Design a protein around this ligand. Structure first.
Ligand SMILES: C[C@H]1CCCC(=O)[C@@H](O)[C@@H](O)CCCOc2cc(O)cc(O)c2C(=O)O1
Length: 340
């Protein structure tokens, strides 16, 4: 087998000429030459079977992506694993090879307004399909947004995804969470489990702001710092939005803070398109029930050059609802279609 960085990357013989690209959750990511389709591809190695949690993350991603088909969602081309459950230690996911990701792009490249507009449209177009399947991505961030050489965008990593469950979304104050800090909606710190579609819209809002200035808009330095940054820009919540927070510990925390004024978007982003800032404001709305939804965002005047509901498809079969040995067995079963 082809050793890579002192680790087994055993994808032969179809996939050869392997170059390191990055890291997934449970293994590295490599480029490789697909000797059948005569194209270079990306391959993610996964080693999850010793842990129930890693098996869950792997299973849900495979189950979702094997049913999803959308231009702005990177699909699974192939899955490589041993022929038997006894022998399967690793799983390799083969996907399209893209040129870069938005995280890497934002470190060095200033985006034109036309690029920001096209990138945002594709994110929302992909998100519309996802949400139409009753699925939440729940970890949208620049590093999960891939771009090819012609700036086509695809959404990656559904390992943190969940089926939407808005009736069971309420929880207590400062309860644990998994998604990436800087892209976490304020209600996550206050009273939400992240089971509603609005947590994804907040992340997209954070991404739009970051495309406008090449820096994260809410760079919280630890779990507790995140809410400081959000309120530092949005200002103090209104009485109406506080009344919507019925949990007493969360509401009383917000009531204990001194007044903060809203920072105008056009002062944070003096070069930004005014229509972009209007949409930004609607995505970064404090109250999730007032936060703009994906289909409304697509119809915003900022995206008028691209908006076409007949060219923004939705899922055929939405998802109705949601030991490691049983999970390995289900991963084996779910990947069987890619064997001879
Ligand atoms: C396999 C897929 C996993 C996506 C999810 C993921 O792990 C993230 O950490 C993301 O940051 C990927 C790092 C490198 O991911 C690529 C880089 C690149 O230059 C071209 C690509 O096609 C990919 C890719 O396909 O990533």
């Amino acid at each position: 087998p082809e050793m890579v960085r002192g680790q087994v990357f055993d994808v032969g013989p179809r996939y050869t000429n392997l170059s390191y690209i990055g890291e997934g959750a449970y293994g590295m990511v490599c480029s490789a030459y697909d000797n059948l389709n005569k194209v270079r591809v990306a391959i993610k190695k996964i080693s999850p079977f010793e842990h129930q949690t890693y098996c869950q993350r792997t299973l849900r991603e495979i189950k979702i992506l094997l049913r999803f088909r959308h231009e702005n969602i990177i699909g699974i081309n192939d899955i490589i694993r041993a022929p038997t459950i006894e022998q399967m230690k690793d799983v390799y996911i083969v996907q399209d090879l893209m040129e870069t990701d938005l995280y890497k792009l934002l470190k060095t490249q200033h985006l034109s307004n036309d690029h920001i507009c096209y990138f945002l449209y594709q994110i929302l177009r992909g998100l519309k399909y996802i949400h139409s399947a009753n699925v939440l991505h729940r970890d949208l961030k620049p590093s999960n947004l891939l771009l090819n050489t012609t700036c086509d965008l695809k959404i990656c990593d559904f390992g943190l995804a969940r089926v939407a469950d808005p009736d069971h979304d309420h929880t207590g104050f400062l309860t644990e969470y998994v998604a990436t800090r800087w892209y976490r909606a304020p209600e996550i710190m206050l009273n939400s489990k992240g089971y509603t579609k609005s947590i994804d819209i907040w992340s997209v809002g954070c991404i739009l702001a970051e495309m406008l200035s090449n820096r994260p808009i809410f760079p919280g330095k630890h779990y507790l710092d995140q809410l400081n940054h959000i309120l530092g820009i949005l200002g103090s919540p209104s009485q109406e939005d506080l009344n919507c927070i019925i949990n007493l510990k969360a509401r009383n925390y917000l009531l204990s803070l001194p007044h903060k004024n809203k920072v105008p978007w056009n002062r944070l982003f003096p070069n930004a398109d005014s229509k972009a800032l209007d949409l930004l404001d609607k995505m970064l709305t404090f109250n999730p029930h007032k936060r703009i939804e994906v289909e409304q965002a697509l119809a915003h005047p900022y995206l008028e050059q691209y908006y076409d509901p007949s060219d923004e498809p939705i899922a055929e079969a939405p998802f109705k609802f949601d030991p490691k040995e049983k999970l390995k067995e289900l991963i084996f079963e779910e990947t069987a279609r890619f064997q001879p």
